[PDB]
Structure 1
């Protein structure tokens, strides 16, 4: 049936997880045809059982079968690279913490606590729990770094960064957005604000330990907020954009950059943001509405096309 295979959709995720997390996928580099019998002798993986997994991977379109051998498909070459963002995605997707968060999702819909399904399972909100968990934090921060590394080339193309002097990336994570921007845009003051127990170090990057719910530091003329607001509710999103308006002067600009809600694409991510953060995906006009409540105005609006999702580039300034 099609409904029973829809019920059994998790089996598709778990099969890819077993293929990628073990490191078996890293034997399929440069679109080579792998002999599974030779892979069995080299790595010690069970020939008969892994051959059954490969047949299911061929069904999913991850592998391609020819000449009694298997290659990764054109689109699934990323699984050969353990450094790829797709590798970090599946490692987090069906991990025990996410699984337990999903099992509290149903129950979380009836609660008016303000606690996410993640918090009900674990006892702390996502980012606070990550502070005491290397696995979740390292994989999450790594994923955020890879997607930051992918988009940066297009950001520099669509927006002139040389017109600015003092740049702050609010919730910048490991800080790879401004590090890569600073390499191609020279002789500027660069700062990255996030929650740091230990401050990261990089040449001409000012790492700040702070909280964007409490306050943003003033005196900067370019502010960046990439993939933050979709981890928050409307009220918290307004509170963040309010703290920008207090900090920002007349000359200042805020680049609200985020994955955007387009009808054509999947709502699956919208549900994940509800489970992990009690947040949501938003459209251009939804982002614009929250900005208007905070006391900000939309000057420019452009779309950035990434492989996995469309992005919403919004240049905001104060009233």
Structure 2
């Protein structure tokens, strides 16, 4: 039926996970037609049982079958690259911690504690738990690093970063964004403010420990806040934007870069933000409301098309 396969949608994610997490997918580099017989002998994977996974991978459209051999689809070439964002997305998606956070989702709806399905399963909010666990922090920050790398060229194209002097990336993580931005735009003061248990060091970047719930450090004519607000409630979102409005002056500008809600694209991400953070995806009009509540006004708006999600580029200044 169409129902039983929709109920069994987990199997798709899990079949891809086995393929990419083991590193079997890395043997399919450069759209090569792999002999599963050869791969079995070399890699030590069972021939019969992996042939059968490959059959299910063709059905999903991850593999293509020609002359009793398999290649990655033109679209699924990224599964050959361990450093691809898709590969890091798979690692987290159906990991033990995410699985148990989803099992509490149903329960999370009934209660009004402000506790995420993740917190109900593990005992601390996502980022407070990523302090303790190295597997989740190293893979999450890697994902945010890879998706940051793909939007660098799109951001530099639509905005002139060469007009600004001091740039602060609020919640940058590894700081990949300003690292890659500094390689095109030189002779600027670069700073990445995050929750740091250990300090990373980048020649051009000035890594600071902070908390944008508490205070944004003033003395910056450009502020960057990319993919943060979707990890927070409307109240917590306004609080962050008000900390900017207190830190900023009239000459200062805030770039609000975030995955935007559109009816065309899937809602699945909106749910995952609920599960992990009690967050949500928002439209431009919804982001503008939270900005007009915090005492900021939209100077400029631009749409960015990433493969995975459309983004909203909003330039915010104080009233």
The bucket for the TM-score relative to the shorter chain is over 0.9
**Runs of 5+ in structure 2 lacking a partner?**
none
Give per-residue Cα distances to partners, 1:74-102, cap 9 Å, x unaligned. Answer: 00000000000000001000000000000
Q: State the SS of the aligned residue for 1:162.
A: helix
Structure 2: distance between partners of 1:78 and 1:302: 28
Structure 2: distance between partners of 1:317 and 1:263: 29
Structure 2: distance between partners of 1:19 and 1:157: 36
Give per-residue Cα distances to partners, 1:7-48, cap 9 Å, x unaligned. Answer: 000000000000000000000000000000111100110100
Q: How many Å apart are 1:162 and its aligned residue?
A: 0.6
Q: How many Å apart are 1:108 and its aligned residue?
A: 0.3
Q: How many Å apart are 1:189 and its aligned residue?
A: 0.4
Q: State the SS of the aligned residue for 2:163.
A: coil
How do residues 1-319 of structure 1 correspond to structure 2 at under 5 angstroms? 1-319=1-319
Q: How many Å apart are 1:286 and its aligned residue?
A: 0.3
Q: How many Å apart are 1:198 and its aligned residue?
A: 1.4
Q: How many Å apart are 1:67 and its aligned residue?
A: 1.3
Give per-residue Cα distances to partners, 1:219-272, cap 9 Å, x unaligned. Answer: 100000000000000000000000000000010000000000011000000000
Structure 2: distance between partners of 1:82 and 1:161: 31
Q: How many Å apart are 1:185 and its aligned residue?
A: 0.4
Structure 1: distance between partners of 2:241 and 2:308: 26
Structure 1: distance between partners of 2:102 and 2:187: 46
Give per-residue Cα distances to partners, 1:268-293, cap 9 Å, x unaligned. Answer: 00000000000000000000000000
Structure 2: distance between partners of 1:241 and 1:294: 6
Q: State the SS of the aligned residue for 2:225.
A: strand
Q: How many Å apart are 1:194 and its aligned residue?
A: 0.2
Structure 1: distance between partners of 2:197 and 2:43: 39
CA RMSD after TM alignment: 0.4
Q: State the SS of the aligned residue for 2:236.
A: helix
Q: How many Å apart are 1:187 and its aligned residue?
A: 0.4
Q: How many Å apart are 1:199 and its aligned residue?
A: 1.1
Structure 1: distance between partners of 2:298 and 2:38: 59
Structure 2: distance between partners of 1:96 and 1:273: 17
Structure 1: distance between partners of 2:12 and 2:199: 39
Q: State the SS of the aligned residue for 1:257.
A: strand
Structure 1: distance between partners of 2:62 and 2:97: 26
Structure 2: distance between partners of 1:101 and 1:306: 27
Structure 1: distance between partners of 2:155 and 2:291: 21
Q: How many Å apart are 1:204 and its aligned residue?
A: 1.9
Q: How many Å apart are 1:138 and its aligned residue?
A: 0.3
Q: State the SS of the aligned residue for 1:314.
A: strand
Q: How many Å apart are 1:315 and its aligned residue?
A: 0.3
**Structure 1: which 4+ aligned runs deviate by more than 3 Å?**
none
Q: How many Å apart are 1:316 and its aligned residue?
A: 0.3
**Runs of 5+ in structure 1 lacking a partner?**
none
Report the number of matched residues: 319
Structure 2: distance between partners of 1:134 and 1:52: 34
